[PDB]
Paper text:
Here we describe the discovery and characterisation of endo-acting glycoside hydrolases expressed by mucin-degrading members of the HGM that are able to cleave the O-glycan chains of a range of different animal and human mucins. These O-glycanases display endo-β1,4-galactosidase activity and specifically target the polyLacNAc structures that comprise the main backbone of many mucin glycan chains. All of the GH16 enzymes comprise a β-jellyroll fold, characteristic of the family, consisting of two β-sheets composed of β-strands that form the core fold, which were superimposable with other GH16 structures previously published.
Structures of BF4060 and BACCAC_02680E143Q were also obtained with the Galβ1,4GlcNAcβ1,3 Gal product present in the negative subsites (despite the latter enzyme being a catalytic mutant) to 3.3 and 2.0 Å. A cleft running along the concave surface of the enzymes contains the active site and where the trisaccharide product was bound in the cases of BF4060 and BACCAC_02680E143Q. BF4060 and BACCAC_02680E143Q have four fingers and BACCAC_03717 and Amuc_0724 have five out of six possible fingers that have been observed previously in other GH16 structures. BF4060 and BACCAC_02680 display 79% identity and unsurprisingly the structures of these two enzymes are almost identical in the cleft region. BF4060 (and also its close homologue BACCAC_02680) has a significant preference for TriLacNAc over milk oligosaccharides and analysis of the +1 subsite shows a narrow slot where a GlcNAc would insert with the N-acetyl pointing away from the cleft and S174 from Finger 5 would pincer the N-acetyl against finger 6, thus generating specificity for GlcNAc over glucose. BF4060, BACCAC_02680 and BACCAC_03717 also displayed some very weak activity against laminarin.
Numbering used by the authors: 36 to 276
């Protein structure tokens, strides 16, 4: 019941400009190293994978990411099949959704199908962020309390979420990993906003490191290990029947 799908096996060498835009500078951890990325230099399509890359070109760090113009409502499931080429110390690869036309983050929500941090190398993080949860100034999220801690991010896996009016469910290789639930409170507390906007698709490989001279989460960057790609074999959204 297939709503949208990219298997990156097109005529073309870069993800279809109809659907996909490139991530851009922002004074936060993931977005920092977008500033000064010359066009599509960290993003290509090649034997059927979207290949997102992180390098340090001449002194200065470069992230590789795109996101969808288009969003999707509740009653969908998102599926992203991806590996990392290698564990990169300071890597910060991300498969996530984000709301289009939401009041300022986090109010309208954020959903993370996969993120990776050098600190817990044998584990990924499936995480949900709201206003209710974080604060505004907070950005901790709520991750699987009881996750998989012998995981190999460098094999292909299929990262995945369901959004219903009722709740957000995460999967990995098609096993449920855990869920966050609408509690149906005073809609004011913005406890569960994940259906009030459409949520998009954001694929990136960012470098972490220092930020305004305070170290971020993905921790210290090791140049030795650069570059590193994340390959998205494909991306699929499915209405539920
Ligand atoms: C703490 C932080 O960096 N927050 C930004 C947010 O976050 C990410 C994490 O919370 C999560 O783990 O997923 C990825 C993994 O790489 C991020 O690190 O991302 C949003 C959207 O880009 C940010 O927001 C935007 O900020 C700008 C101002 O710079 C703008 O004002 C806009 O309203 C807001 O959406 C977080 O800063």
């Amino acid at each position: 019941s297939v709503l949208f799908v990219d298997s990156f096996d097109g005529s073309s060498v870069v993800p279809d400009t109809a659907v996909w835009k490139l991530c851009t500078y922002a004074n936060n951890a993931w977005s920092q190293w977008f500033r000064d990325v010359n066009g599509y230099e960290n993003v290509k399509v090649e034997d059927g994978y979207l290949k997102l890359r992180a390098c340090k070109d001449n002194g200065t760090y470069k992230n590789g990411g795109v996101f969808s113009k288009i969003g999707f409502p509740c009653g969908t499931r998102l599926e992203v099949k991806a590996r990392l080429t290698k564990l990169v110390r300071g890597g910060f690869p991300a498969i996530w959704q984000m709301p289009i036309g939401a009041p300022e983050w986090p109010r309208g929500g954020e959903i993370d199908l996969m993120e990776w941090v050098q600190g817990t190398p044998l584990q990924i993080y499936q995480t949900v962020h709201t206003y209710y949860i974080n604060g505004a100034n907070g950005s901790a999220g709520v991750t699987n309390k009881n996750p998989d801690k012998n995981f190999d991010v460098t094999k292909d896996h299929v990262y995945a979420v369901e959004r219903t009016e009722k709740e957000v469910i995460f999967y990995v290789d098609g096993k449920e990993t855990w869920r966050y639930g609408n509690q149906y409170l005073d809609e004011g507390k913005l406890q569960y906003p994940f259906c009030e906007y459409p949520f998009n698709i954001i694929l990136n490989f960012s470098l972490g490191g220092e930020l305004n001279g305070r170290m971020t989460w993905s921790g210290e960057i090791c140049d030795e290990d650069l570059p590193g790609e994340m390959w998205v074999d494909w991306v699929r959204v499915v209405s539920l029947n």
